[PDB]
Structures are given as structure tokens and as C-alpha cells.
Amino acid sequence: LEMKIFSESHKTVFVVDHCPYMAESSLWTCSVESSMEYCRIMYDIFPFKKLVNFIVSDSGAHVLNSWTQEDQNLQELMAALAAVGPPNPRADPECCSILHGLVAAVETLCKITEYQHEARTLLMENAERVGNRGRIICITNAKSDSHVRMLEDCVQETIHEHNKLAANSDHLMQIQKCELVLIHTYPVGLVSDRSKKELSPVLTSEVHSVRAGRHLATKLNILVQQHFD
């Protein structure tokens, strides 16, 4: 019940689509700049108490970092960022989807942090024991609001079955509460900045609709302000 260190800030997921529609006129690059600034803030304020992991989804999940302490250094991250180039603009729009990143994100949140492992080392069979609440941040170019709603459904069913699998596993944990941050980017000028609607006892969901540019970084900053928590 120690909700302090076990806040959603302790677990941060970044999912950005490297699908070629995010290279419309390097748009993903801009999203990278904003998300990298958020990741800067988290490590600087909370050197080892707020943790961040990053995922890219060019038709498949490409995870660039782990919960471990060594990965939580921005230079190590930047090497992996430079490794992924720009999405091929002539490549198949089919098969490319952020869903791989979201499913991998659920798997990453099920994974334990080193501090959570220390808590397991001390604790033993206590009620209201250590919880596993986390936050997911997705940045993408969305097509329809129904697209976003189906993504919410996918995440919910993924969490349900993944917790079913992880409950019997005693080297990974179930998720008490996830938080979902949905971010859509239109460059020129449909998603609605839909209010928070926590869809399940485990699931929490949020929707936003904002254009490109660091007003998104400021909105991120407002989120980080809630996320100092």
C-alpha cells in the first residue's frame, strides 16, 4: 500500500510510431525531441526512482532500453535512436503498425524494477502488497477516433490475458493500475481530446488531440507536472 515509490511515474513507457506516415514532410523526429525532453526531466528529478523505457513500432516492436539502471542514461538511448533511421517513405504502409509497440509495452510493464525486487526481497505474503501501476505514453498519427477506441480495446484485452499469465509467474508481476496517454499528431489541419475514461479495474485511459510543435512539449510538461507525483 506504499503508493509512494510505486506510482505510475516509476514505470514510464514511450511508444512512438516509426511507420512511414510519420515521415510525411521527420515528424517522428519532432516527436522524438519532445519525448526525449520528457525523459530528460524524469531522470534528472528522480535519479533512480522514476524510470522510463522506449519502444518504436515500424511494423514490429523495437525496444531501445530496459528498466535497468545502466539503460537509464540518455546517451545510451541516443545511440539506439540514431540506429533507427527515417521510415522508408516508399515502404509498405501495410504491416506497419504501432500495436506491436503497445503489446511489447504491456510486457515491459509486467517486468520488475530493481527497487521492486528489493521490496520482494524484504516483503513476504502481506496483504495490500506491492502494486504494479504504470503509465504508457503513445504518440502517433491516428486515422479515426474509432481507431483509437479499438486501440483501447486491444490494450485492455492484452492486459487481461497478460495478467492471467503473469499471476502464476513469480518472477514477474500483475498490473494493479495502468495509465494510458494517447497522443495524436496532425501536421496540416479528427481525434477528439477525449477526457479520461478508466476502462477497467486495472485500466485507465486518456485521449488527447493536438497538432505538431512544442506546445505538445508544453502539454507534455503539464503531464510531467502531474507526473512529478
Partner: peptide, 23 residues
């Protein structure tokens, strides 16, 4: 495990469902 294949099923499932908006 026996049901991680259901994780892959979910991923694929919603991947096909995504095409309607993708197209």
C-alpha cells in the same frame, strides 16, 4: 506459455482490425 500464443493472437487480431482505418 500455453497462452502467450493468445497474446500473439490478440496482436494479430487487432492488426487485421486496424486495416479498415489504414485503408
Amino acid at each position: 506459455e500455453d497462452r502467450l500464443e493468445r497474446l500473439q493472437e490478440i496482436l494479430r487480431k487487432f492488426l487485421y482490425l486496424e486495416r479498415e482505418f489504414r485503408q
